[PDB]
């Protein structure tokens, strides 16, 4: 058995043909679960669950090393709120490649209607496509003052929330380099795909959006159709992203974008297609 994070360690599962996974996890570890708020309250990342599907899809279907991870038809459910170091048991149950995943504070946890469900979606694994992908595109785009940015968001992420290195824009296309720092990227290579790296792309999107909307009731990921990953453990791409063209000109609801990741070299990490964005 596999070791992560996250998910935690297989456990018996009461339905016949599940497959499930266990773990504990507070605001102190993976300590990235302390840094992101919304309103004073801390609130898991819902790249979280991305990650964690990922990694079952990783240990739940066998293959070789080289195998591209794929997690399908995402929606994100309820928010997990932390209370600072109180432990949360985390849960993803399995069952003919669906997943569900939900979250019971550690003394109810015995009682099924103490779990609160916080993503579903579809796993798969295919062997690594030989086709050509595709390079990060030359932009030649205008540079997003990260500055101002970081300034805005300061009341929803700390530090080790904040990886986003360079970004430029063009129309409704951009190209971002995210990095991580310290610890995050000491422990990388413990994950698919860090959250706090994928997390960094997404708030590439937030960025280019927070050049022309307010950043009051932010944006939250609520799904994705599609996120196919080639490469595990990365801790530096390029992301190339676009926004689908918004209902508004002046202030949307939602957002739809698409994200391709490169390594610094230029070979394709992973895709993520319409990935849904909505106001909290
Ligand atoms: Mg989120």
Redo the contacts with the bound molecule.
Sequence with gaps: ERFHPLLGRRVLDPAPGARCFTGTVSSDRPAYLGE?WVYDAI??????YLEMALAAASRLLPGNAADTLIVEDVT?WS?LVLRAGAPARLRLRSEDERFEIHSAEPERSDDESAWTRHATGRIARRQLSPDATGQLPRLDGEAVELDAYYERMRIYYGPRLRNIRHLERRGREAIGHVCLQGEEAQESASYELHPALL?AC?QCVFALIYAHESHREPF??LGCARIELRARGVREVRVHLRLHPPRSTDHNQTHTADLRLFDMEGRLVASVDALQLKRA
């Design positions: 992101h609130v898991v990342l819902g790249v979280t994100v928010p997390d997404f939250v990921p």
